[model samples]
Target chain A: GMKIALIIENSQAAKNAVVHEALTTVAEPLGHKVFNYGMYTAEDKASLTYVMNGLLAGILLNSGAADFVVTGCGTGMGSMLAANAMPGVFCGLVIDPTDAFLFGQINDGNAISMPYSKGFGWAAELNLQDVYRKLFDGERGLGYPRERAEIMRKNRGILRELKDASCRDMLTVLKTVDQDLLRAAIAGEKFAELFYPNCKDDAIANYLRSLD
Target chain B: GMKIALIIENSQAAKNAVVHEALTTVAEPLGHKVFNYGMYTAEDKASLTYVMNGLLAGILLNSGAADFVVTGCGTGMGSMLAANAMPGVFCGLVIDPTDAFLFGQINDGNAISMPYSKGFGWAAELNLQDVYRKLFDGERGLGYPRERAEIMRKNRGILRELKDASCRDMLTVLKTVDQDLLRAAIAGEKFAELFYPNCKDDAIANYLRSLD
Candidate 1:
């Protein structure tokens, strides 16, 4: 069974349980276990800001703890950016079920982001269920119109190669970013518990541990 | 007049001229000026990858050369992810005109991304027009429900604050990342022409010039 991590930023913490429930509802039947590394509630000690979401996502995916990550902010943009800023992580922002279905097929990214607020009213749960259903269960897409599938596949490959070519080494890049913010991003309640053991990179884990 | 930059990655270079034409046909007639920072054709010697799209976007937007940006790759996910990873950049993935209109209203992000490959078939030009119309022409949405505008505004502000909190200084990051990759991202034939004069940051412009 693949491990799926469900994460949420502070503003949407109240809905974490609901999002968790729905993700498991779809993911579990397929033998995927959902883990909540979360701002489980507004009152939790850890506030899962978008930056924190990224930090945690890096920790989870980089370690073998989670094979897939589901995270987001209000509009899904921040979390997607945060997730993508990490190494070896590909994330898609999925607004509705169609987005979930199609992004699943073509991009086949390791993580997906959703908007917990903004148009998340009126049968939004139904929308969530459908999105997860398609994301976890649908036929993955390579390219559309059949003829250009090969080109589409090629583009995806180059996008990954180009990003790897351009970005900084993870440890060194983090060193250059704001110190306090990086500290805050990883100071969540469950971060230590979940991060160090599964983490593959000694440098990242050591640096993070130095904070405490 | 507001300036809009239209950028396309090399994967969809075939549609470059038309995307620029469509964006301007709608945007220009409405009194907005449009700029194309493009992978202009399938045969260009230099290709604009998503990484380049993000670097170009950061240069254009941060330099105040562009009031808004329209950029995309095959699935739209990569470009949106790329653009949003930059400091002070707020971008959204747009599948249809409704995505454009609604995201324009609630998120009020500085950029929008579209899927140039998927679902981009016959009359896709009309779809582009409709998107630009709602994006540029409509009474921009402030809040989803009339009552939630204030909360929505606060969230947007918080999102900006969080990005600022964690990210490194742009020049510092650019320096730390792979120079060859950065060099290639800016080597487009039209890059230096449109970029330098409008750039607000002297340090970035000087650094870029050093690459020449």
Candidate 2:
């Protein structure tokens, strides 16, 4: 059972319902827990930018509240770029089942960004279903062709070393970016209620608590 | 004409000469300049990490010393993650010509990371040439299918706004990370000699100068 967090950006807020349904439709039946950190509707009081999605993913992953993140913007490029800018987040721009499957088999990152605005209506919904199914149904990190799995595993270890050596600690990351963006990211109606219970890092939880 | 910077991570340093040759062979003839930031011979004193490649890419791009950067690790995953972790950097991992063409046409990022250790020998060299050719041969940022270009352009603009609003200023970023790591990233042999003369941002240059 995995903990999956879905974050929707303001530009694509209207599609939240469709995206959520597609994800939960595939994910829930598999016994995975889905957390919706939202701009739940177009009229939501809390607005989220792509930048905030990255920050939130970083926080959720590092705090152990989330095992994976699903996020996106119009082209998925922006969100992918933003999420990857943070530590401990490997985000891929997944537009189709092929992209999703390849990323899972090769990159096996912790997050994915889909192009919500680019593909919409009924067609978009179908694509989302396939993408999620391919993403969630597999044993990831298997490596393509099955021959490179061992080497891929070793490289992932090295990747971790590079990130650990380079990135600021999560608490420091939380304190570094624009606080307004940070505050707004966690301002979703269900954020604190959903976050604190699942969050496993004391320092991070304390930092958020101190924010009040 | 572009200033193309090549950075090789330690794990894949031995492939630097081959990678550099492929890039220069494609890039130089197109009126672009290829700058070689070493692990020149794999025995160089100035060792570089994937984390440092990202840092150096950020500084070079933000400082206007280079317009594009090419870097990679064993799987290309590590360097891509590290490069995207810095502000003002958009990096992609390209394993084939299709990946290169698609990324340039759709994502239009300023940097790319290729897997140097995955495919080697004459076969690897051939892939490198094709990848560079696809990446550098055409006008980029043209959305796929040609119909979504305008919306893609708008989203790219919005992405810039989100990043600008969310990220710390470059100077502040320089001050915030590990000083030792920062010191080592810039300690590349050709860094000061090539970087100083071309860099347009005095503040960034002066900050590096202050490090001496």
Candidate 3:
């Protein structure tokens, strides 16, 4: 069972319930827990942006609150760019089940940014359901075609090493980044309720607690 | 006509001609020029890695020698991450025509990383051809759904601002990063033959020339 966090950026907030339901429908049957970090509605008082999605993903993953993240904006690309900016978060901009499945098998990333509005046409919910299933139902990191699994595994390690060398740790980033952005990112009403209980890291928990 | 740069990493070097043929076949017909800065064959001397793909991409785009870059690894994730690590390259991992179309219409990035061997099964060239057609066939940045075009544009700008703030200038990166990596990245036999004459930036040109 995995802890999957669904984060919706403000512009696409109206469709939050759709994404949440699709995720829970697939993930819950597999015994995974789904956590909804909102902009729950388009007019939700505590609004979240793509940049906030990045910080929130960083916090949730690093603090051990979520084992994986599902987040998106209009195009999915912006949210992906933001999520990938955060350390330890390997985010992919997924358009269909193939992308989700391939990303899971090869990249073995813990987060995906799907297009909530763009090309979200007829059977959009079905697409989301399929994407979720492809991602959650499989044994990931097995590599596509199976023959090149070793090299793919080696590259994933190399990518991680490169990221570690380039990026700052989560706690340090939280401390050094703009306070207002960090504050807003964690300001969702359910953030405190859902986060602190699952959080496993003391330093991250303490730093977030001090913000309150 | 646009100048498209094709780069293949060492692990997948054996498939270099396959990728180059697909790219040139489509791009040349569109009145776009294709430059092969290659591992040429699986055994070429100036071997290029995915990390080198990133540096070469940064140099080509920022130097104005290439308008678009096509590169890949087994899964395309590592190459995308590396390309995005550089300041001026916005890269997407594309598997099909839809992803290619969406990325061009929304992210409008300068580079794309594809999967060469992972799920690169029957008629992979057809997939590459279709992807290139969707990407280059028409006008871009028109947004996926026309209604949200404005917001998508604004967010793209915001993403650029964030990247600019977080990443250092290319020249600075070139000057300070491991000199050997930089050297190897530019060591392709055809790099000088293809890159310098078209290079628009004198500073980048001077620095690269000094490496010899």
Candidate 4:
């Protein structure tokens, strides 16, 4: 089964259960197993922040724990940026079902960030369900611009190369950043339980395990 | 004077000169100054990727070099994400003039990120012009949801406190992260000229000026 991970930041942590339900309701039917690496509630002790969300996504994606991730904070921008700051992560901030459909077809990125507030009123749960449906309904890698698919592919490659050049290797970044900040970011109640087992890089995993 | 900074990534850097022209055309007449921190052209020496776009914006906004920032990448999502990753930044991705007006009224964010490609055909310059006008038009802070302005302001305050709690100060972030990545993010053609004098913090400005 394909692996999919869902992460939530503290501000919107209360919606974690609803988001997990939506992703699984849509994705499990398509044969993906979903894992919630979460800030389960707004007052949960495992305080999750956007930076921590990005770090978790990087570790998960790079270490082969998750094939894809779904995350977001407030406007979706914070978590999206945090995710993209990692070495090999590509994320999009999706605002609605149409955005979901277009981002899935056009970018086919590895993760999605959503705005859990602001426009998220009046049948927001339905909007969430339809968004998850559009994102996981089919296999990816499609024509984005119809005639300019080649250039589209070329630019994706360029973006990857540019990201690789702009960010340091994940391990180095993890080591170089503040130890307290790192500790606090991954302090989520179930982080160790969710992350330690599925993580593929023994070194990275061991480093994290050592911290706590 | 209200200082506005404009940035565009490589994929659509060809639109750089015109976007600068458009922002200046609209806002300059109303007593604002526009500065271009850009890829300038697809073949410019420094490669300013979307990540760099975010870092540059964060540095600019946090340091007081600019009052507002205008930036975009292929889909606008990358730059928007990047910009919002910084602690104090508030950014919105604008697809049209209407979105610009709404973002201005509802969010009053310091940055507007646009889609340099996607729907940027035909008289694209006119779209840019109108978008700039809507963003830069008048006294900014305003109501959204008709009657929820107080709650919105309160939430805005809450967001600031939460961000401060979650994120390390930008100076600490600068000191701890990858120096090379930081270097590249600010390597735009006019980055030094645009940033140094208007920068309000000596420590941050000194550290940046010390670099190549």
Score each candidate by Cα lDDT: 0.81, 0.87, 0.90, 0.83
TM-score of chain A of each: 0.88, 0.96, 0.98, 0.93
CAPRI-style quality class for the chain A–B interface of candidate 2 = incorrect
- In the range B1-212, model 3's lDDT, one tens digit per residue, is 89999998998898889889988889898999999999889889899999999889999999999999999888788888889999989999998899999999889899999988665644678889999999877888999887888999899999999999999999999999999999999988899999999999999999999987
For residues B1-212, what per-residue lDDT tens digits would candidate 2 score against the true structure? Answer: 99999999798898899889989999999889999988787797889899999888899889889999999988788899988887788899887888888888878889998877553423567778888988888899898868998888787788878888877777789988888888888988888988999999999999988897
**How far off is residue A56 in model 3, in Å?**
0.4
Which segments of candidate 1 are over 4 A away from where they belong?
A1-212, B138-141
lDDT of 2 at B98: 89
Full candidate order by lDDT, most accurate first: 3, 2, 4, 1
Worst 10 residues of 3 chain A by lDDT: A115-124
Highest lDDT against the true fold, candidate: 3
Pitting candidate 3 against candidate 4, the one with the higher TM-score is: 3
Write one digit per residue (lDDT tens) for candidate 3, span A1-212: 99999999898999999999999999999999999998889988889899999889989887889999999888788789988998999999898889888999999998999877656644678889999999999699999869999999999999999999988999999999999999999889999999999999999999999989
| TM-score quality measure for candidate 2 | 0.51
The residue pairs in collision within model 1 are: A105-A140, A105-A141
TM-score of 1: 0.51
After superposition, the stretches of candidate 3 with alpha carbons farther than 4 Å from their true spots are: B1-212
Worst 10 residues of 3 chain B by lDDT: B117-126
lDDT of 2 by residue, A121-155 (tens): 33568778899999899699898868988888788
Two-chain DockQ for each candidate model? 0.01, 0.01, 0.01, 0.01
> Residue-wise lDDT of candidate 1 within A17-115, one digit each (tens)?
889888888889988878888888989876768977876677677666688899987877899999899877889999877787668767878899888
Weakest ten-residue segment in model 2 chain B by summed lDDT:
B115-124
Error of 3 at A105 (Å): 0.7
Candidate 1 backbone overlaps, count: 2
